Amino acid sequence: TEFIRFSGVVNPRTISGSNSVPSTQVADRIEYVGNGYINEAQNMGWLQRFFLNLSPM
Amino acid sequence: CAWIPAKPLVQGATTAQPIPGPVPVANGSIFQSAQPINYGYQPLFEDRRPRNIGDTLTIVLQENVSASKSSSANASRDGKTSFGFDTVPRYLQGLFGNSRADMEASGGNSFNGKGGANASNTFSGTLTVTVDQVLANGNLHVVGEKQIAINQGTEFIRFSGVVNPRTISGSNSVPSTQVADARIEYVGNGYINEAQNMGWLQRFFLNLSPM
Amino acid sequence: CAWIPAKPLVQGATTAQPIPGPVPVANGSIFQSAQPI
Amino acid sequence: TEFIRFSGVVNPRTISGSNSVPSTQVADARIEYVGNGYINEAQNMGWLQRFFLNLSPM
Amino acid sequence: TEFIRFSGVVNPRTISGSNSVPSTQVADARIEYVGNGYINEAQNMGWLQRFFLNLSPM
Amino acid sequence: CAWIPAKPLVQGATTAQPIPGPVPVANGSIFQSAQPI
Amino acid sequence: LNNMLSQLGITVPTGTNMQLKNVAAVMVTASYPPFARQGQTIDVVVSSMGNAKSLRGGTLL
Residue C17 is nearest to which of B38, B54, B136, comparing CB atoms? Predict the structure, then answer.
């Protein structure tokens, strides 16, 4: 599954026509996250992450 | 064998002796009736749709169904880390003097799954059916069969369904797609049909043999 | 086997004998109703 | 034999002209297109292969 | 079998013409398109491969 | 196996017998209502 | 017109010219009076709907 979440503050004067407002006109959060093994395959892995954060060079 | 007794599908006499008719009544008229059979009312300008049990209707199958389904998924992860001095300062020899800190590692995980399915059928025949009964709303239950014996076997084409007496267009014809409860059978007999059967052992293996 | 007994999906008789209809009422009219449903 | 079965709820205003309505306009659309005989049997996985698919690692 | 399920909240003013509204105009859009059978089973990772993916270093 | 019992997703009868309707009221009108819903 | 013909028992093929000029689609409006009885009759107003030129001696069906 994929979750797309949006949050912000919209001034009720930039809304144009068909109740649409570009995200660039919204003040204050965009998340596009996934689940399942498809999402799991994009994680570094504990050992590789530890080496990246600690291994010299 | 070809000499085994057999009954042709067109059974009974293939001839009819014409009836002489009725002797005229000496009523002074050259015209003579012929014992009218049906006394029911028949409209003139209507499309002569089937209306009673014995009425016949023409069905154009023109069936064409096609369904497809596909799905796929994949997931690939690849990583490789390395670290090595190959030359260690004198002051750092304590921690990395040997290959103590020298490290190398690799890892991979690839998965790919796929699936699909298809199902299509077509039918391009014409079969004349007969009304079986008249429903409460006026819909007609039509059932018909046709047997053809080209040579060395027979084929039966049977149709059944419910036809609304308003989709019949012009020459008493209605597409099969407009018939509800469509039951269509096109079966055969003889060694030609027998050759298309799997066989008991192959069928058992197909239904039971692993893989 | 192909000789195993089987029942075609189109079961029942494939023929219908037409009904003769109702004898006319001697009301002096050629037109005769047909029992409206 | 092949059985094509349809079920759903149709609003009596999307029916256009010759008593026809697209399946996309029918709510609760249940569509089945199934088959029988050895033709359909040949498209089944098989017990052992299905067990391996559902249980065998990787 | 495949199940396509949709859920959401639709403002009764974006419905245009023939009772149609784009999914992008529906709030709380929940869309599921799932499958069953061995076709769907073949797209699962497998217990051992999933464990290695979630735990095996690198 | 393909011979295991299964229930098609389109369950229940696939046929509906039409209702004859209501007998007319001898009110002198050819038009007859149909129980508005 | 095709629906009426089919109901009467005539099914015109879907693909046809059907270029007639003796008929006009109309809207009929009536005033249901209070305490209306089943057998009573009321006056109606018929107004052309499409591009009919006139309804001089027409018949509402």
Answer: B54
